[PDB]
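User: Hello! I'm new to structural biology and keep hearing that structure can be predicted from sequence alone. Could you demonstrate with noursin? Please show me the input and the output so I can see what each looks like.

Assistant: Of course. The first part below is the input, the amino acid sequence of noursin. The second part is the output, the predicted structure written as tokens.
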Amino acid sequence: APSNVLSTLLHGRACV
């Protein structure tokens, strides 16, 4: 799912 909280720091891996 979208980063939202952790996405912002895990882009290209766990989130877009």
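User: So the tokens describe the shape?

Assistant: Right, they're a compact way of writing down the 3D structure. Reading them back into a model, for example: DSSP finds no helices and no strands in the chain.
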